[PDB]
Design a protein around this ligand. Structure first.
Ligand SMILES: [Zn+2]
Ligand SMILES: [Zn+2]
Lengths: 175, 177, 175, 177
């Protein structure tokens, strides 16, 4: 008799805890699926297990375009010193030979370096940086909801074992 | 009085949980503090909430040396094509003028590109990439322990206020009875 | 008269040189006026000595937009670290207070920094840097021609006076 | 032979002009070499054609410290508005939350911002701006001398060929006697 009230109370606490934890897990899954759907502009939401890959892709695809942005800048520094020493000082930067009576060789150099540094590349990979940064921010915002979804996926079966064991304890304890 | 028995049972469970959760936050705190001490080889462990600044520091200091390595490679490609067109084809790559009877200017070019080349910059950037990646991995390993320490820092005051309220009810009600 | 032959000889050389140098000055003037017309996209070419003021105009208008580009990037780092901590770590970066039960204050922070992260300004002042660099290169290309025009404007009067002195010499030396 | 004496007269003028223009080139070279020595306080004068790298490096080292000064001022403006909203209105500028019953968090904000507000960095950037502008002005003062030395290095060999032709032809015209 006396401990059956504890067995019933424990089982009731564990049932209600499992229900509440399940609801929170489902909410986190919805939120993370909504983020995955909008982050890449998907027509239907992917499986929750795909968030880790979508986040790693974004973390890398952003780092790639940011390396490429500094790459363009450092190359454009070098090509500008080539053009400047030709225009300002009548000279090829690499071999330090002047262009006196050699205006065609100077013209060829300038027409070459002008084709090394168009602006449309910078426009495009700045648009890429903007899109990958937006997408990564959307996935970073739900990181803690995926992590709670993950730990609740380990905690709910452990609690369910406790519920089933206490259910059998109750079913025995009647006599 | 079954309602007082429930009130004492409800406070028991709460006090015991605040104990279990306090022990878990404190373990999380010791784990993240030792990881912070280890990651930067510190003489004593920093405050628990310096974790975010040194994680963000390692994330960006690693990204910097990885951009610098990729930059060095691209510059080394370009300078190699300059050296190669001078050695293989007797030409300056930029202006398309040969070095026939100009061996001193060819020599100059080659000595210049040889100074825009060198092992030490890649060697020491690779050591820095290895060091920041080690430090970042040590801090990333405890990310989940920092996040639970933080969530428990919200939950313990809420649970503590709930106990205080329950304790007051237990006091007021045992006086009534 | 041997020295009258020598006089008519050097007077003639000076006269022909004054012509040659006059034609070189005029060729330089037309080149720098053409550069000034195309550099700022003018309906008519300006006076030759407007060159130095519009050159140092382009030098400083370029330096301004390049400082503003570097400024925008540094500000965008600060605003991004503020956004990042709010999204990733649920804290305000400045005061180190979390947003638990305060998601309206978190939302206010994120909306405020988003209004500090627009790329229209970068798009526009990258067009400005491209435009001022083009005009500065056009004006830099003719710098040496302008400097020759300037030195010949000192030399031609000096030589002109020489001719006239040798003309008086010749006119005196006939008898 | 009047045509031979006209050829001797032409040769004499070219020879004397080459001498005059050579003396002018050497005067230009000396001036730019002493200016390069002065601009960076060098203990021996560099080769005349290093003038372009010295001018380009002075232009960019000046321009970057002038950008750094503008950077520091805009950062100091932003940090001043953070300090001011905390001191004057008891509030965090970023999140719009007051510091009532939170004066430790207010104190942390103010101490963090005080560690950004360092005036020594402006002193050092102004010292560097002063030094690079002095250096650049020394090199800009000799710009016209270097551009002169450069045009004369094209003209003297052309005139030297003309001499070598006329010195051959004079000797041919006395062989013709
Ligand atoms: Zn070349
Ligand atoms: Zn705040």
């Amino acid at each position: 008799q006396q401990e059956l009230k504890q067995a019933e109370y424990q089982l009731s606490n564990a049932r209600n805890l499992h229900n509440k934890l399940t609801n929170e897990m489902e909410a986190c899954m919805r939120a993370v699926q909504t983020a995955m759907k909008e982050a890449r502009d998907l027509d239907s939401a992917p499986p929750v297990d795909e968030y880790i890959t979508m986040l790693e892709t974004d973390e890398k695809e952003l780092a790639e375009v940011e390396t490429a942005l500094k790459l363009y800048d450092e190359l454009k520094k070098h090509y500008s010193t080539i053009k400047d020493r030709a225009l300002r000082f009548n000279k090829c930067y690499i071999c330090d030979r002047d262009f006196t009576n050699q205006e065609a060789a100077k013209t060829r150099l300038l027409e070459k370096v002008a084709k090394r540094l168009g602006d449309e590349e910078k426009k495009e990979l700045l648009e890429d940086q903007a899109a990958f940064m937006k997408s990564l921010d959307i996935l970073r915002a739900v990181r803690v909801k995926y992590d709670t979804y993950q730990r609740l996926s380990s905690e709910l079966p452990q609690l369910s074992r406790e519920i089933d064991s206490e259910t059998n304890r109750r079913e025995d304890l009647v006599r």
